[PDB]
Amino acid sequence: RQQEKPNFLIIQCDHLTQRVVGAYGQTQGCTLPIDEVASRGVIFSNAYVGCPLSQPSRAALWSGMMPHQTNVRSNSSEPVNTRLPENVPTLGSLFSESGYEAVHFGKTHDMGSLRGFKHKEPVAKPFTDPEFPVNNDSFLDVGTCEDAVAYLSNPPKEPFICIADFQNPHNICGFIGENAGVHTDRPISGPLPELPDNFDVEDWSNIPTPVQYICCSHRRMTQAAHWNEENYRHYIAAFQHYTKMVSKQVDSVLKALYSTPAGRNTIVVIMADHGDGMASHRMVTKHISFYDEMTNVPFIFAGPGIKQQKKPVDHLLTQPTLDLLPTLCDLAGIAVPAEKAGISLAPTLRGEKQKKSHPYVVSEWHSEYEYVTTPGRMVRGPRYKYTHYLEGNGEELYDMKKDPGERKNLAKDPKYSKILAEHRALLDDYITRSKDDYRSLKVDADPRCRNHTPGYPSHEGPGAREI
């Protein structure tokens, strides 16, 4: 038993959302291979990432730390962001030093947190799509899929830990570029998805300043700011298409996995580095805001020793950015360094009592490319989500039980003043225990990016990257 170790296959998809994954109960037909894995295992309803942005999320994830601690807080490359020091234990270092073969395929964008994995760079394999634009994101996934299939088809050593980091549905970014501004959409042959119930922003004066002006600071939002309903539904359709594309590749990867006896000895994890607005709150992609579509990601486990659960686990707050490292170490029988703040979910996965749990979980924003630096923090408690931004001391407060779509900010309502204070207190506790420098940080927000009536439809001009 204890010397017979499982393998691991970690499949991560950039921008993948709970909404689009059928296992979560909202959208049918886009992720059947992922849903089949979920059906054999356990999915988590509350799985919040440490930052809704790729490089900060990935640097944090593979090191099991938070972004203010890695100090990789934006997507900028060296020297604005500096690679994780070589003395910080990572997933790869812990697994490699315990005798695992550790391999990584696909997207990196890790700022050194992948140290210990042997990385193979994918090669772009272009192809033509008859209905949606496809770019090097989609072409790279073809290479990644080929590499992962080749590896899992003939695994040279057990035990192994393999990461397959897919780009899609990130090609949604390219879609927005091809459809920027006022435009008529190219016809498509599918049924057209409906807008979500939280599409509209009811009151722009009741949201924080940085969220009001995402249209100025986020290039993709500048592009989509004046989109009509048709435009946004075609956006959702494209997102579903790119998700279907990556799910076919997941299928190929799983077929390769289960083509040898290594497969049945493998624990499969499916997650995303962050989500996508999917037109909720008029939002496209990810930038500044902390709404569930972007921060609450699919987080799915199945494999030997993991007990099947039909219902999603919703009595726990999880933080994949912190919890993946100790969970995988616990499943592999590898000791976790004491400084890591994550909590192993292996008890829940085994069907045992989860004695330790997070009383709340957190997300961070700092900047994307240092055009605008507008730090903020999210605290998800058991029932409410609280957000705070330094710029204007803006706050949000959402009842996630009665208002899961986050349509009614409760922060200015005196009836909720005690709940608001209570979540402010969770942020104070986080700052103390994590040594967050949040309270000391400076806002850098040019007033030319805050210079029209609040809200994306009223956006005028070319946005921050242009001025």
Q: Which residues bind Cl ion (CB under 5 A)?
A: 367-369, 371-372
Q: Which is nearer to Zn ion, 7 or 222 (CB)?
A: 222
Q: What minimum distance in Å lies between the beta carbon of 458 and Zn ion?
A: 7
> What mask, x for binding Zn ion by CB under 5 A, covers residues 191 to 220?
------------------------xx----
Please tell me whether residue 221 binds Zn ion under the rule CB under 5 A: no
Residue 262 site contact among Cl ion, Zn ion, none (CB < 5 to 8 Å, cut-off depends on kind): none
Interacting residues with Zn ion between 433 and 462 (CB under 5 A): 459
Question: From Cl ion, Zn ion, none, which one binds at residue 328 (CB under 5 to 8 Å depending on kind)?
Answer: none
Under rule CB under 5 A, residue 282 binds Zn ion = no
Q: Do the beta carbons of residue 66 and residue 434 sit within 8 Å?
A: yes
Q: How far is the CB of 368 from Cl ion (least distance, A)?
A: 4
Residues 6+ apart with CB under 8 A from 285: 15, 172, 173, 176, 218, 220, 221, 276, 277
Q: Indicate the burial class of 157 (C-beta count within 10 angstroms; 0-12, 13-18, 19 or more).
A: exposed
DSSP string, 73-136: -SS--TTTS-PPPTTS--HHHHHHHTT-EEEEEE----TTTTTTSEEE---------SSS---H
Asked whether 332 and 100 are in contact (CB, 8 A), the reply is yes
- How many whole angstroms from its chain centre is CA 153? 28
Closer Cβ to Cl ion, 267 or 445, answer by number = 445
Q: Which is nearer to Cl ion, 26 or 451 (CB)?
A: 451
* 371 contact choice in Cl ion, Zn ion, none (CB below 5 to 8 Å, kind-dependent): Cl ion
Q: Where do the DSSP E strands lie in 348-413?
A: 361-367, 373-380, 384-389, 394-399
Binding footprint of Zn ion, residue count (CB under 5 A) = 3
Report which residue type is found at 339.
E
Q: Which of 317, 409, 406 is nearest to 363 (CA)?
A: 317
Closest-by-Cβ residue to Zn ion is: 215
Which CB atom, from 162 or from 216, has the smaller least distance to Cl ion? 216
Q: How far apart are CA 295 and CA 290, in angstroms?
A: 6
Based on the shown chain and the rule CB under 5 A, indicate whether residue 426 belongs to the binding site for Zn ion.
no
Residue with tokens 């499949």: 11
30 annotated among ligand-binding-site residues = no
Nearer to Zn ion, 103 or 216 (CB): 216
Q: Which residues are registered as beta bridge partners of 120? A: 105
Contact partner at residue 430 from Cl ion, Zn ion, none, CB < 5 to 8 Å by partner kind: none
Q: Where is the binding site for Zn(2+), in residues?
A: 215-216, 452, 459
Question: Residues in the site for Zn ion, rule: CB under 5 A?
Answer: 215-216, 459
Q: Where is the binding site, in residues?
A: 215-216, 452, 459
